[PDB]
């Protein structure tokens, strides 16, 4: 019992037989029994475990244990083809390819910064504006004092260019051809630059475009902000431990040491810690349940990148059977005919929740930076006025 595979139907009380159970491996078992030819009997394992060799007793532990001894004849289930299982049971070719994947929270908007209003122009531009501001005010000074027609001191040439930039002209203007060229091209500057600020901010607020912070495992590997995490006892944690490759060594030494514990005890709790993080936790999961929990309410999670290893799920039979060869040729038939793919679109993507703009008003958080620069600029000017009062009157 594990979704989107076998699961108890909503009226499982009243029904009986092969009809209590629905899912991928009920539709799959119906297709295996059609091409091979028999009557199947769905029997959920009593242990509820997939299969593993017990430490020193050497008795197996589940669906592998039922196939080896006598208790079943086939296990049409999400049963991973590993080495220690192929030595006792016979797998088919994989009806499903998968691997370790990365689950994150669906990328939300932001928290808008305290200097988020500067975003429509790059920081290369906002610095070019400030130094062209002084560079014009210097040229307006030199050309007004030397080669006069005076009034444009460096105190007044900074003020004329401030009014010209902030779209509010001043009660001074150059009166010389030389000073009116400096004024004229600084006026053309601030027409284009401020029309480019408004236009790029109109592009922002119209088309909302979210980005994922991480988009692979290497981009997970070279950060420190977002935490990792797997289950504490599975094939996923054992994958990162015995790996040697380049990156999963670095992704183990992080997870081994760094605390509070990134490891979890249940898949359902690890999905919760993705949602209880607002984007700092990335639960490393097996590819198929990651695409499951993505397409379920509440829609908050997302698979990124591609798979980290490649493994596969396979229909298992006991070691020596008249089912082993016909089931293997059934899986390769259902793969090429697209039955294994049309059953994939059904249970993960069609028999499930979410599918495939509003322009709320600007909140105070979006423009809260200029309210802080204002009051900080009013507090700075009350400092200068006290310094001016001391310097002038006492002397």
């Amino acid at each position: 019992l594990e979704s989107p595979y076998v699961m108890m139907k909503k009226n499982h009380e009243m029904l009986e037989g092969n009809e209590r159970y629905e899912g991928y491996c009920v539709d799959l078992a119906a297709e295996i029994a059609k091409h091979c030819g028999f009557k199947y009997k769905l029997t959920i394992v009593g242990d509820g475990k997939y299969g593993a060799r017990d430490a020193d007793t050497k008795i197996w532990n589940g669906m592998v244990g039922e196939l080896v001894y006598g208790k079943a004849d086939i296990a049409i289930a999400p049963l991973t083809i590993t080495l220690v299982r192929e030595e006792v049971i016979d797998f088919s070719k994989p009806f499903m390819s998968l691997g370790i994947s990365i689950m994150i929270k669906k990328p939300q908007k932001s928290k808008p910064g305290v200097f988020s209003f500067l975003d429509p122009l790059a920081y290369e531009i906002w610095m070019c504006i400030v130094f062209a501001y002084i560079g014009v005010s210097v040229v307006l000074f030199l050309v007004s004092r030397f080669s006069p027609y005076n009034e444009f001191g460096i105190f007044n040439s900074l003020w004329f260019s401030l009014g010209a930039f902030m779209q509010q002209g001043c009660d001074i203007s150059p009166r010389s051809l030389s000073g009116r060229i400096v004024g004229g091209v600084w006026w053309f500057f601030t027409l284009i630059i401020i029309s480019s600020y408004t236009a790029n901010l109109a592009a922002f607020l119209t088309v909302e475009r979210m980005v994922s912070p991480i988009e692979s495992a290497e981009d997970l590997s070279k950060q420190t902000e977002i935490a990792y995490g797997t289950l504490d006892s599975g094939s996923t944690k054992e994958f990162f431990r015995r790996s040697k490759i380049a990156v999963f060594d670095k992704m183990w030494t992080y997870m081994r040491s760094a605390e509070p514990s990134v490891f979890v005890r249940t898949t359902a709790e690890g999905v919760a810690r993705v949602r209880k993080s607002k984007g700092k936790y990335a639960y490393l999961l097996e590819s198929t349940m990651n695409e499951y929990i993505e397409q379920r309410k509440p829609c908050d999670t997302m698979k990124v990148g591609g798979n980290l290893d490649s493994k596969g799920y396979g229909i298992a039979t006991p070691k020596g059977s008249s089912l082993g060869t016909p089931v293997n040729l059934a899986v390769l038939k259902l793969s090429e005919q697209g039955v294994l793919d049309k059953l994939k679109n059904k249970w993960w993507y069609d028999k499930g929740e979410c599918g495939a703009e509003k322009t709320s008003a600007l909140s105070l958080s979006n423009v809260a930076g200029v309210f802080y620069i204002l009051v900080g600029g009013l507090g700075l000017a009350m400092l200068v006025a006290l310094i001016e009062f001391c310097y002038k009157s006492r002397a």
Binding site: Q108, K109, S110, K111, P112, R275, K278, P298, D300, S363, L364, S365, A368, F371, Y372, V375, L378, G379, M382
Partner: protein, 135 residues
């Protein structure tokens, strides 16, 4: 203080207690207290300037503390509301959920008290310029 949903009349003093965050307003919290401190200084300094009018500087300097108290109320109310808006932002989108924040009658009082210090801080400067041209 919870009011309708499970009407838990136990008023949670947020410092040690336990869904919403509502320690989002701890960054905003100093600024009404800083402003009330600057305003209470100004009320001392404007009253004693009326008690003793042989000094004039007690009037204008009390004019500064009113106007500094207002600018601490703006950064109070901006950082209050900015801390609100980016928490109704961090809500997972849904069509069966609604959040409705709504400011109350003590938010209006801190808003009204901005207008009264900027009034009295202006009027303590005109009181200075009349008093300083008197002496």
């Amino acid at each position: 203080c919870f009011l309708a949903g499970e009407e838990r009349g136990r008023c949670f003093t947020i410092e040690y207690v336990m869904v919403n965050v509502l320690k989002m307003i701890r960054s905003a919290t100093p600024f009404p207290l800083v402003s009330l401190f600057f305003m209470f200084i100004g009320f001392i300094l404007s009253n004693i300037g009326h008690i003793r009018p042989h000094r004039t500087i007690l009037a204008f300097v009390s004019g500064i503390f009113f106007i500094l108290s207002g600018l601490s109320l703006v950064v109070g109310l901006v950082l209050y509301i900015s801390s609100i808006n980016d928490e109704m932002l961090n809500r997972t989108k849904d069509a069966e959920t609604y959040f409705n924040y709504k400011y109350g009658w003590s938010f209006a009082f801190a808003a009204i008290s901005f207008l009264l210090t900027e009034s009295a801080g202006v009027m303590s400067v005109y009181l200075f310029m009349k008093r300083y041209t008197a002496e």
